[PDB]
Amino acid sequence: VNKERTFLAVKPDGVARGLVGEIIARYEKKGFVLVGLKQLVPTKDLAESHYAEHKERPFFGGLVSFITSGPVVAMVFEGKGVVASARLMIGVTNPLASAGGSIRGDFGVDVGRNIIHGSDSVESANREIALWFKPEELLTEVKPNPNLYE
Amino acid sequence: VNKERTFLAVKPDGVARGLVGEIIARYEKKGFVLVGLKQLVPTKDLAESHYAEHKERPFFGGLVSFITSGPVVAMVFEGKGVVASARLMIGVTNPLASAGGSIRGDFGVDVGRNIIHGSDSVESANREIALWFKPEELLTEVKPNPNLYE
Amino acid sequence: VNKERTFLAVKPDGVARGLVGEIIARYEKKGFVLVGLKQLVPTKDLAESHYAEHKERPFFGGLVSFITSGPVVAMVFEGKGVVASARLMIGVTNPLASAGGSIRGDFGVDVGRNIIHGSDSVESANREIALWFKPEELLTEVKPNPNLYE
Amino acid sequence: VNKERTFLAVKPDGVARGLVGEIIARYEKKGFVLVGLKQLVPTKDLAESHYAEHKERPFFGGLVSFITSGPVVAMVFEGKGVVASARLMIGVTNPLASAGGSIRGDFGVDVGRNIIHGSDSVESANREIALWFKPEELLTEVKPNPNLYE
Amino acid sequence: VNKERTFLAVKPDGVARGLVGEIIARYEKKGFVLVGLKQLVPTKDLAESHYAEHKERPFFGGLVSFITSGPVVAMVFEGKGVVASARLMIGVTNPLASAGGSIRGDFGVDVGRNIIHGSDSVESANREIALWFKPEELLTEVKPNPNLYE
Amino acid sequence: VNKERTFLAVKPDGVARGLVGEIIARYEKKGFVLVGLKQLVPTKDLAESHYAEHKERPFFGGLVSFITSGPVVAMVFEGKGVVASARLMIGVTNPLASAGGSIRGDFGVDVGRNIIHGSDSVESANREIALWFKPEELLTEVKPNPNLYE
């Protein structure tokens, strides 16, 4: 279905390195539709909730601290297979192992400063979207370029 | 002063044509700092207030209708001379007269679909920013690349 | 051999989305030489002949209708291993599975609107070229940048 | 009117330097619609006719020889004010005097190798189009991105 | 004459902001030939000599300190009218007044951090080149793309 | 460790095709720091030493001749995993087999004209760096964008 949505957040390092527009442009070119978008400095509570899955791990603390360390550009994209597609456009966890052509492959060097976050599944996408955005902040009627879908 | 701010809004045509990231990237490259950012479908009241200066003109109606016709990406940039600089990066009113190298020169053809709005003065910038953004939505502490300012 | 040729056609969706120049530029950068090029709205006969291999399949009808639905930019590129190379630059059938860095990976989302066609073999390349182009429309003397071939 | 057309020809030097896609992409981004397109090696007769206005000047010979010296990509673009707009995107006669942001400003250095030709007026555009293209080679129904024109 | 040369130095701020390749690529695209190139951290003596013309001004001290504050990428480009052309590609002294399409127009905001230096005349170019480069470090035989000069 | 270094040399074909800035920009974007950089026409001795590992093979002669055939831009980049990362950004030996997104995948077609050389291991990187650069030519203090490393 073409109404699939994913949550992406350009982390503080990406924002600080001026990659926000470059990242958004890549998704717009692909044909995904921007359904939600806003810059914010995440509070500890939102952060801990975002990374709840790692709450029992030791690096959980470092994740929370970093993401709340500066502005973040949170966005929600809609489109067919956007969740897996966006992961693919992002690259693998280690930027050094990510292929040129992907966001982390092109701009990153360190796991801890890997620029962007993308939901890893439709269900995590749904949880993250509802976590980071009020429903009023999301487009209800999405109209993509007609030359994109059969 | 380097804390000058301007208000930019990628109008519905720019959003629909997938130029949001391309426009943001241009300002980030320049060295201006993203201080506010969000996508929204403007209500009639916000629109009429935004274009209040033309409220006595006949084309006022067309301005209001268009901007409320679809999503808009509103943003606030900070930096030295950002208000005049951003206007310069945008181009002149008529995209056909705008030089290559500017947003309207590169992507537009019609006055009525000229892609983006930029405050025309510091005072209009201050009015528009306060109009489109709650104070909570704007970064308070802005830190630019240290290689930008002497 | 460096005189190998392949047939590429930017389908109606690619033309309509303004990707013609972006696609041609990618091949020119690679070092392949443009040997034939023209825009046309394919007739049903040319279309059915182009997709003859699927004439017994049900989706054959949809293929024919789409390609004749609007202008198409047909082109022939020459160079060593251009047939496989061009396929690689294009991506896989499903744009969602195509890697960033490839045409379909960067710009497409749907199999049915996958932007471009590239011959799948030297023999199909030879058949397609002879199908879409009169011999008078193809360069006879091709001279590539001397820094490309040993 | 939005049905205005102009004739552009990427001269032999532009084709040889691999700038065809880069030039087409610039016009597509602007929002102009590709209405005719083909590569050809101009004959002396077409060349002399193209440059007829200089037939009494001494450099006329050099113009004719160069343009017939290799392949040329001829194209016709449609859009509002496309004739003046395209000239503006091209730059001035001397590439060294052309501003960055324009084709000649970005890629050329010599008047004699100034990359591209653009009609200088609507009437010359009409003469050149009819000179370089058969009517069958031009789109009759042009549909631009709806977000381009008011 | 096509053997004209100019001296360009990407100052410490440009190097630090990762603009070295972007700046070199702009000149290579234009058709100018790289004749000398090296990264170095300028000593005080070279700096004072470089800016000797301002030695009687008060800002002379600030010029010397900045340029010796970090690595610099010095380069010499050759081509017809390269000295004026390169200045034009650079922009005006104040990056805020420089037009999009130029280096300072696209990437700078402050006079003191204006990214790059370009000789202002053929004679200053000759003095700077001889100042920053040993003759052994400059190409003697320069061969440009044959499609550049008539 | 983040102080790892690799040696890259844009071979004569890459320099001649104007890809120097494009290649440097890719590494700068990735976050690697330029530690050494200079253009030179390699002597036979440096060449034979560079390719010593193939000195017993027949193609050794062709390697030496080509690299000494014109200017070369030698550079040293520093960063975590830069040696493997840079190889990955370069592509595989055969440009035709290299994926879009990599230097050879995007710009090359022939093994013999594969544009750039990158050390294949840390030890070969150390040997090549010491071979091509005097210690005085390498930055001692390297400071990367702070948003790159955790």
UniProtKB/Swiss-Prot annotation, chains A, B, C, D, E, F:
GO cellular component terms given for this protein: cytoplasm; cytoskeleton; phagocytic vesicle; plasma membrane; ribosome; secretory granule
Reactions catalysed, as given in the entry: a 2'-deoxyribonucleoside 5'-diphosphate + ATP = a 2'-deoxyribonucleoside 5'-triphosphate + ADP; a ribonucleoside 5'-diphosphate + ATP = a ribonucleoside 5'-triphosphate + ADP
Cellular localisation: Cytoplasm
Major location (coarse): cytoplasm
Catalytic EC class: transferase
Chain's role: Major role in the synthesis of nucleoside triphosphates other than ATP.
Protein name (record): Nucleoside diphosphate kinase, cytosolic
Organism encoding this protein: Dictyostelium discoideum (Social amoeba)
Gene: ndkC-1
